[PDB]
Design an enzyme around this catalytic site. Structure first.
Site, PDB file in Angstrom:
ATOM      1  N   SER A  61      17.013  38.550 -16.723  1.00 23.72           N
ATOM      2  CA  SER A  61      15.783  37.776 -16.865  1.00 23.72           C
ATOM      3  C   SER A  61      15.531  36.767 -15.740  1.00 23.72           C
ATOM      4  O   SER A  61      14.470  36.145 -15.704  1.00 23.72           O
ATOM      5  CB  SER A  61      15.764  37.033 -18.196  1.00 23.72           C
ATOM      6  OG  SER A  61      15.509  37.938 -19.272  1.00 23.72           O
ATOM      7  N   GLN A 117      11.591  42.033 -27.295  1.00 23.14           N
ATOM      8  CA  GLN A 117      11.763  43.310 -26.599  1.00 23.14           C
ATOM      9  C   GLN A 117      10.583  44.218 -26.891  1.00 23.14           C
ATOM     10  O   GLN A 117      10.019  44.214 -28.005  1.00 23.14           O
ATOM     11  CB  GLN A 117      13.026  44.030 -27.055  1.00 23.14           C
ATOM     12  CG  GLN A 117      14.313  43.215 -26.835  1.00 23.14           C
ATOM     13  CD  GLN A 117      14.668  43.024 -25.358  1.00 23.14           C
ATOM     14  OE1 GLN A 117      14.008  43.567 -24.458  1.00 23.14           O
ATOM     15  NE2 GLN A 117      15.739  42.238 -25.097  1.00 23.14           N
ATOM     16  N   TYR A 147      10.018  33.213 -26.478  1.00 25.51           N
ATOM     17  CA  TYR A 147      10.438  33.913 -25.248  1.00 25.51           C
ATOM     18  C   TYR A 147      10.403  35.419 -25.458  1.00 25.51           C
ATOM     19  O   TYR A 147      10.925  35.910 -26.469  1.00 25.51           O
ATOM     20  CB  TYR A 147      11.843  33.468 -24.937  1.00 25.51           C
ATOM     21  CG  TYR A 147      12.412  34.037 -23.650  1.00 25.51           C
ATOM     22  CD1 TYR A 147      13.235  35.146 -23.670  1.00 25.51           C
ATOM     23  CD2 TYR A 147      12.165  33.410 -22.431  1.00 25.51           C
ATOM     24  CE1 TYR A 147      13.781  35.637 -22.480  1.00 25.51           C
ATOM     25  CE2 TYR A 147      12.721  33.906 -21.224  1.00 25.51           C
ATOM     26  CZ  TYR A 147      13.512  35.017 -21.280  1.00 25.51           C
ATOM     27  OH  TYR A 147      14.076  35.469 -20.124  1.00 25.51           O
ATOM     28  N   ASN A 149      10.066  39.456 -23.452  1.00 28.47           N
ATOM     29  CA  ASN A 149       9.906  40.432 -22.349  1.00 28.47           C
ATOM     30  C   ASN A 149       8.577  41.136 -22.479  1.00 28.47           C
ATOM     31  O   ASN A 149       7.945  41.456 -21.458  1.00 28.47           O
ATOM     32  CB  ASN A 149      10.992  41.500 -22.375  1.00 28.47           C
ATOM     33  CG  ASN A 149      12.337  40.951 -22.018  1.00 28.47           C
ATOM     34  OD1 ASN A 149      12.421  39.993 -21.275  1.00 28.47           O
ATOM     35  ND2 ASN A 149      13.405  41.550 -22.555  1.00 28.47           N
ATOM     36  N   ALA A 315      20.267  37.854 -18.216  1.00 29.93           N
ATOM     37  CA  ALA A 315      21.394  38.716 -18.497  1.00 29.93           C
ATOM     38  C   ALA A 315      20.893  40.116 -18.672  1.00 29.93           C
ATOM     39  O   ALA A 315      19.718  40.312 -18.959  1.00 29.93           O
ATOM     40  CB  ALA A 315      22.094  38.258 -19.750  1.00 29.93           C
ATOM     41  N   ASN A 340      28.068  39.578 -19.130  1.00 30.78           N
ATOM     42  CA  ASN A 340      27.114  38.690 -19.806  1.00 30.78           C
ATOM     43  C   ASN A 340      27.920  37.722 -20.672  1.00 30.78           C
ATOM     44  O   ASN A 340      28.386  38.095 -21.740  1.00 30.78           O
ATOM     45  CB  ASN A 340      26.158  39.534 -20.641  1.00 30.78           C
ATOM     46  CG  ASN A 340      25.221  38.704 -21.487  1.00 30.78           C
ATOM     47  OD1 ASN A 340      25.095  37.491 -21.314  1.00 30.78           O
ATOM     48  ND2 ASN A 340      24.551  39.362 -22.419  1.00 30.78           N
TER      49      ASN A 340
END
Length: 358
Positions: A61, A117, A147, A149, A315, A340
């Site tokens: 990220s 996601q 947050y 993606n 990560a 990670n």
């Protein structure tokens, strides 16, 4: 390599590697604008390849910082506006929940609950349209930060549409090339595979799998040298000759929303310097970082504040990265690892190093 920097970095990173069982790590400290590099351990345990200054790591990220700057560059080019509705660039997005959702909301995770996601099931582009058309917000736009993606990933894809370039072509031509990031890639070329570290997840060598909006949200790989140069460019955007890219960098560090003591930029996140270390350290734990939180709009956004701790964690399944810098002190750090390992450990180590040098 001044002994102070050597001692500070080694005293902090050596125990971190031991405690976290990190196979390989590279660190760059930018001190008074100049980079100093440190490497440990293995890029590939099986083949006994060491981490070097040329090893590529998955940024995960941290990639969002490039996406935020590329978006910023597109705004500076006059190609998009953050105040534009998402539907201006994706007219097929006709479902009524999109009324009032702007590119700003997408870029800053404030659209109203877009998920962390994109579902693995979304393979085709028609799958992606269906997913966004069918998504139901939990919250009005610009009220909560979650947050995601699927949020900034869509921003990046839309941001490059007026250019007609693919996301990768736009990134290469508009960000990587002008900044001489010549070992930074969205897709690692065969020529550079010898340098591509393996990530390690439960002892298994792994690389990130393809997924929707991967390039835009988490798909950049880079070296510690190029990442040091990325931090240098973000510390001092005025040294950048390309006018729209300089402006893009500035826009990505503007403060758009506040939650607790953090401010949301485009990709970058910022706090006032001096920071309370517990606040950035505990704040980096995914328990807080990935939580739904109310936001206060900053109306209008504050332009990049020089006394800030500007950072991003990132990560993938096999890699853990962190970048942080303080413009007003010409100070920064990049930490790249092929495991990670928990965010707070990264931020703790970074703060211990930068605090000692500041």
């Amino acid at each position: 390599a001044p002994q102070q920097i050597n001692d500070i970095v080694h005293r902090t990173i050596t125990p971190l590697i031991e405690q976290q069982k990190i196979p390989g790590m590279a660190v760059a400290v930018i001190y008074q604008g100049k980079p100093y590099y440190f490497t440990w351990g293995y890029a590939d345990i099986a083949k006994k390849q060491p981490v070097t200054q040329q090893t590529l790591f998955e940024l995960g990220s941290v990639s969002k910082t490039f996406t935020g700057v590329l978006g910023g560059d597109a705004i500076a080019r006059g190609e998009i506006k953050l105040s534009d509705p998402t539907t201006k660039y994706w007219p097929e997005l006709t479902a009524k929940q999109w009324n009032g959702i702007t590119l700003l909301h997408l870029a800053t995770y404030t659209a109203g609950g877009l998920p962390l996601q994109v579902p693995d099931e979304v393979k085709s582009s028609s799958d992606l349209l269906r997913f966004y058309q069918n998504w139901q917000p939990a919250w009005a736009p610009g009220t909560q930060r979650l947050y995601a993606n699927s949020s900034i990933g869509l921003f990046g894809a839309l941001a490059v549409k007026p250019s007609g370039l693919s996301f990768e072509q736009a990134m290469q031509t508009r960000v990587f090339q002008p900044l001489k990031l010549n070992h930074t890639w969205i897709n690692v070329p065969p020529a550079e595979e010898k340098n591509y570290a393996w990530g390690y997840r439960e002892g298994k060598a792994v690389h990130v799998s393809p997924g929707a909006l991967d390039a835009e949200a988490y798909g950049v790989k880079s070296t510690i040298e190029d990442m040091a140069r990325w931090v240098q460019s973000n510390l001092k955007p005025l040294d950048i000759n390309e006018k729209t890219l300089q402006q893009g960098i500035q826009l990505a560090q503007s403060r758009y929303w506040q939650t607790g003591d953090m401010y949301q930029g485009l990709g970058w996140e910022m706090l006032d310097w001096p920071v309370n270390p517990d606040s950035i350290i505990n704040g980096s734990d995914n328990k807080i970082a990935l939580a739904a939180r109310p936001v206060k709009a900053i109306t209008p956004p504050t332009p990049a504040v020089r006394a800030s701790w500007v950072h991003k964690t990132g990560a993938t399944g096999g890699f853990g990265s962190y970048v942080a810098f303080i413009p007003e002190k010409e100070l920064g750090i990049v930490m790249l690892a092929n495991k990670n390992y928990p965010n707070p450990a990264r931020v703790d180590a970074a703060w211990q190093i930068l605090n000692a040098l500041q």
